[PDB]
Paper text:
Like E1 enzymes, aminoacyl tRNA synthetases (aaRSs) are adenylate-forming enzymes (AFEs). PfYRS contains the two motifs characteristic of the catalytic domain of Class I (sub-class c) tRNA synthetases: “HIGH” and “KMSKS” (70HIAQ73 and 247KMSKS251 in PfYRS).
We identified adenosine 5′-sulfamate (AMS) as a broad specificity compound that hijacks a range of aaRSs; and ML901 as a specific reagent that hijacks a single aaRSs in the malaria parasite, Plasmodium falciparum, namely, tyrosine RS (PfYRS). The target enzyme catalyzes the formation of an inhibitory amino acid-sulfamate conjugate, via a reaction-hijacking mechanism. Potency and selectivity of ML901 for PfYRS thus appears to be associated with a stabilized loop over the active site.
Numbering used by the authors:
A (entry chain A): 20 to 247, 255 to 372
B (entry chain B): 17 to 372
Write the structure that this text describes.
């Protein structure tokens, strides 16, 4: 039993280090000690070009989970994007974007057996009685104001026009968790309200198989007053360099620093190091083997923001290269990327 | 002319008697245009299976359906089983709800309706046959209206703002609104308490620039037996005559019913004579002992209204005749549930449920 318990403890510690919040790691240990494959999932509204957090950052946690034997589902939330007034509600364009998402994921670390690309409308229509019965029962269990606390999962707020779709959307997202038999909800922190709703629903219905909530931190925006104007998976080297140099990067400050966050959350996990290239008069080249020294050097002003930007832009361009090469060589992926670049984001 | 004059003449007489069994028709101009089609018009009413059926949903409904089906319409009975589940009927138990729905169909099949142009559709069954079409409608309707506009439809569920409002009370009117388009309904023929969601569907047509808008042909609410009961309902105790009540129960309920002398306002006994008995028989034959003035036949409603308001018809005489005619109209239903052994046990089974 020793070797069986040793690895699970170090698995949990590596998971909790790359995850911002885990609702009860004690339950996660119970599921990690199961003689089966766990079901993890994340969901995505095909609303346009893919954010760097949904591709490069996503591959880091996904490969950590799948390499231990877990299955990770990519929930292509096409009906949710239509419900959330994305892509002018055109479901035809949404499915085009969804196909572009699969091509990006397959070229940035998710061309794997333990990854599944599931379309929301396709899977719901296969078992509609089961899915919609879930949605109905969930709506019967919570009041309006409790459901309006989940408005953040759509990028909305209670200060604007609150449409009935904003009540229906979280009922369906809560239903997906049971419909997909999810063990671990691996979504961003901005999704935790509806994730806490599914656990609350289990207590109401006396369901003992409660999903574990494993939230990953939100990558801040490139500009100043931003916490969630961004790097896209299709940006060329010229675009990444232009966006990084104009980005917000306050000296000695780590919070809401999108440049440091890219180095801490994407670059460092992907390389197990951070090679900072500088001129000698600015401190010279230095190889960082721990985030503790990187944080210390930036807070104390050892790393100037200009030097951090140039290295972050260089690393991001290295990580985006297999994506660029897939879209420049796979002609069917190129035409798919060229077509979705013609859409108005709503 | 020849055929043009005769054709336009029968359309206006079909329009005139349809509006007679109607409390409010949202745009009669639209209804006359609908009748100008050689195809059958699709009308529908929906029912939550939530226990015993009372006469407003059985006797009163058969009169309206017979008038529509004999005038070139097809009528759909929409068994709203999932809606009853969504509204916490029969303790939400979907198995009990489906048995009540089967009991409803047994009553309607023995109410004396022309079954050739009548269909019974289960919501859950039809939705699951075309779930992509149906739920796409629900989703698009939810995108079109805000929560405050949707909460104006709470009365279609018998709900109020003063109580805790669950999300089911937002999804319910979105689904009922979608039913109208899912069934390709030309005429929403429901009670007037349903008009808010019927107005929502017409507003949805204007949002989506849909030119085929449904006609709202609402019927009045049959009042309850006691004074002040504006609507007969099983949620209001002692207010209803049920389709399974015996002659003794009907007589006993009507004798204690509210029937103020010389006034028809808020008079439920007079309402049963007007909305149920008179349209069924096309006359009201008031039977009386010679001690009390002998029999008298009323061929129009005003003749009946005039004799009652001025005191020529005593309340007891009106109550005795209303009880007798209702007992006669319920007789084919009683015959079915006493001769059809399978229907009798079905009635016995649903009466063992607890109403919620
Ligand atoms: N800057 C950032 N940093 C770190 N993580 C980030 C972002 C970011 O930026 C953004 F604003 F564009 N998204 N995410 C994360 O990526 C994923 C998809 O995002 S989404 O398209 O918006 N879908 C939704 O929100 C969900 N309602 C869709 C959904 C629907 C049904 C389900 O059963 C499950 C999910 C979710 O996990 C998000 O948390
Ligand atoms: N006393 C009375 N006099 C005259 N008409 C009366 C009543 C009465 O009494 C009551 F309180 F018990 N109901 N009705 C009328 O009968 C019908 C069913 O009634 S219900 O079971 O409550 N279904 C609902 O309310 C609807 N949400 C169900 C529904 C769901 C989806 C649809 O696509 C369409 C409909 C509707 O037409 C009602 O208006
Ligand atoms: Cl199913
Ligand atoms: Cl379909
Ligand atoms: Mg795969
Ligand atoms: Mg038939």
């Amino acid at each position: 039993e020793e070797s069986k318990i040793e690895d699970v403890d170090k698995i949990l510690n590596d998971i909790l280090s790359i995850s911002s919040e885990c609702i009860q790691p004690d339950e996660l240990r119970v599921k990690l000690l199961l003689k089966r494959k766990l079901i993890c999932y994340d969901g995505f509204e095909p609303s346009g070009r893919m954010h760097i957090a949904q591709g490069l950052l996503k591959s880091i946690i996904v490969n950590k989970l799948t390499s231990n034997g877990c299955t990770f589902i990519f929930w292509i939330a096409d009906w949710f994007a239509h419900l959330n007034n994305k892509m002018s509600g055109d479901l035809k364009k949404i499915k085009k974007v969804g196909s572009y998402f699969i091509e990006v994921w397959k070229s940035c670390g998710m061309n794997m057996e333990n990854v599944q690309f599931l379309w929301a409308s396709e899977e719901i229509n296969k078992k509609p009685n089961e899915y919609w019965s879930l949605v109905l029962d969930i709506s019967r269990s919570f009041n309006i104001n409790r459901m309006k606390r989940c408005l953040k999962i759509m990028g909305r707020s209670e200060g604007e026009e609150n449409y009935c779709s904003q009540i229906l959307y979280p009922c369906m997202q809560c239903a997906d968790i049971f419909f997909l038999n999810v063990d671990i909800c691996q979504l961003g922190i901005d999704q935790r309200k509806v994730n806490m709703l599914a656990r609350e629903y289990c207590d109401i219905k006396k369901i003992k198989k409660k999903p574990v909530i494993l939230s990953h931190g939100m990558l801040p925006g490139l500009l100043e007053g931003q916490e969630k104007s961004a790097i896209f998976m299709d940006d060329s080297e010229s675009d990444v360099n232009r966006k990084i140099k104009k980005a917000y990067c306050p000296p000695n400050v780590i919070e809401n620093n999108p440049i440091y966050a890219y180095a801490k959350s994407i670059i460092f996990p992907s390389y197990n190091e951070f090679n900072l290239v500088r001129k000698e008069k600015n401190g010279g080249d230095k190889t960082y083997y721990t985030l503790q020294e990187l944080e210390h050097d930036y807070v104390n002003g050892f790393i100037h923001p200009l030097d951090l930007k140039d290295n972050v832009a260089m690393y991001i361009n290295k990580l985006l290269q297999p994506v660029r090469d897939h879209f420049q060589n796979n002609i069917e992926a190129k035409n798919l990327l060229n077509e979705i670049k013609k859409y108005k984001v709503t």
